[PDB]
Design a protein around this motif. Sequence first.
Motif, PDB file in Angstrom:
ATOM      1  N   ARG A 119      -0.383   0.699  -5.358  1.00  0.00           N
ATOM      2  CA  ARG A 119      -1.694   1.003  -5.459  1.00  0.00           C
ATOM      3  C   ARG A 119      -2.264   0.927  -7.108  1.00  0.00           C
ATOM      4  N   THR A 175       0.795  -1.298   0.133  1.00  0.00           N
ATOM      5  CA  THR A 175      -0.045  -0.091   0.059  1.00  0.00           C
ATOM      6  C   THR A 175       0.903   1.318  -0.043  1.00  0.00           C
ATOM      7  N   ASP A 201       2.998   3.638  -4.952  1.00  0.00           N
ATOM      8  CA  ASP A 201       2.169   3.993  -6.335  1.00  0.00           C
ATOM      9  C   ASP A 201       2.132   3.181  -7.505  1.00  0.00           C
ATOM     10  N   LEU A 242      -3.792  -2.332  -6.848  1.00  0.00           N
ATOM     11  CA  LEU A 242      -4.731  -2.577  -5.702  1.00  0.00           C
ATOM     12  C   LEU A 242      -5.817  -1.662  -6.082  1.00  0.00           C
ATOM     13  N   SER A 243      -5.584  -0.488  -6.470  1.00  0.00           N
ATOM     14  CA  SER A 243      -6.744   0.422  -6.900  1.00  0.00           C
ATOM     15  C   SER A 243      -7.768  -0.244  -7.911  1.00  0.00           C
ATOM     16  N   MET A 279      -8.190  -3.565  -8.339  1.00  0.00           N
ATOM     17  CA  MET A 279      -8.913  -4.507  -7.861  1.00  0.00           C
ATOM     18  C   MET A 279     -10.213  -4.126  -6.715  1.00  0.00           C
ATOM     19  N   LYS A 280     -10.227  -2.678  -6.818  1.00  0.00           N
ATOM     20  CA  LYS A 280     -11.451  -2.081  -5.681  1.00  0.00           C
ATOM     21  C   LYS A 280     -11.303  -2.536  -4.257  1.00  0.00           C
ATOM     22  N   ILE A 281      -9.978  -2.640  -3.935  1.00  0.00           N
ATOM     23  CA  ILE A 281      -9.496  -3.253  -2.541  1.00  0.00           C
ATOM     24  C   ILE A 281     -10.018  -1.923  -1.710  1.00  0.00           C
ATOM     25  N   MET A 282     -10.838  -2.460  -0.332  1.00  0.00           N
ATOM     26  CA  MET A 282     -10.986  -1.613   0.434  1.00  0.00           C
ATOM     27  C   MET A 282     -10.434  -1.988   1.939  1.00  0.00           C
ATOM     28  N   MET A 283      -9.788  -1.097   2.657  1.00  0.00           N
ATOM     29  CA  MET A 283      -9.593  -1.298   4.103  1.00  0.00           C
ATOM     30  C   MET A 283     -10.500  -1.083   5.163  1.00  0.00           C
ATOM     31  N   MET A 333      -8.687  -5.158   8.278  1.00  0.00           N
ATOM     32  CA  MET A 333      -9.102  -6.209   7.174  1.00  0.00           C
ATOM     33  C   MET A 333      -8.885  -5.575   5.822  1.00  0.00           C
ATOM     34  N   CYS A 369     -10.505  -5.801   1.840  1.00  0.00           N
ATOM     35  CA  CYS A 369     -11.713  -6.627   1.467  1.00  0.00           C
ATOM     36  C   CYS A 369     -11.806  -6.294  -0.192  1.00  0.00           C
ATOM     37  N   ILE A 388      -8.611   1.664  -1.407  1.00  0.00           N
ATOM     38  CA  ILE A 388      -7.270   1.883  -1.858  1.00  0.00           C
ATOM     39  C   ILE A 388      -7.287   2.525  -3.241  1.00  0.00           C
TER      40      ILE A 388
END
Lengths: 97, 108
Positions: free
Chosen positions: A84, A27, A30, A87-88, A90-94, B104, B106, B5
Amino acid sequence: WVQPITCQKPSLTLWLDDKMFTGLINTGADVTIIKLEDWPPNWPITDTNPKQSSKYLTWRDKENNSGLIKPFVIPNLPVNLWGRDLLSQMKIMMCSP
Amino acid sequence: WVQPITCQKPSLTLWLDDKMFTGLINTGADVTIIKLEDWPPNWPITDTLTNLRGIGQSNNPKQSSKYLTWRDKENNSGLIKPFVIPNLPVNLWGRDLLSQMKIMMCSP
């Protein structure tokens, strides 16, 4: 999918142009970094300071989501580093409980 | 709370002992790093030979001599012992801290 952040290495395994790579979810960066030792030598690279993939690579995950990244290629690191840029896409949320 | 992200810097603001710090969520490291310029100079450090070359840092970083109490704005808290390194652009929150926040990742 779900992955807790633990002391363990947070990993993703996926394909870049139909070759499998594993690496560390990173994370703090960039851009994605692929180890030169893991870099298919027929795949062209260019300087920028560090080398970078000349071509955009199609990433695909095991659920067949896909997109494009243009990673840096660097010697002497222990692991591939998913930035990112990937990761951005892949629509990944923390999240926290 | 939720934080997607994005291309933007993924940041957390929190306290270590009595001071507020902002920095970058840094899942790639197992230790936290504070920029030396943000380090309260009354807070004691120890020189180490801790090799952080692998997470793209020094082989001789300073480290907090004491554990620091971290607290977030919801008043969750815990303990970390961060490294203190000159000439970095941002503080770097490592998994030592992120794992104590029960974070986590997700995907939809």
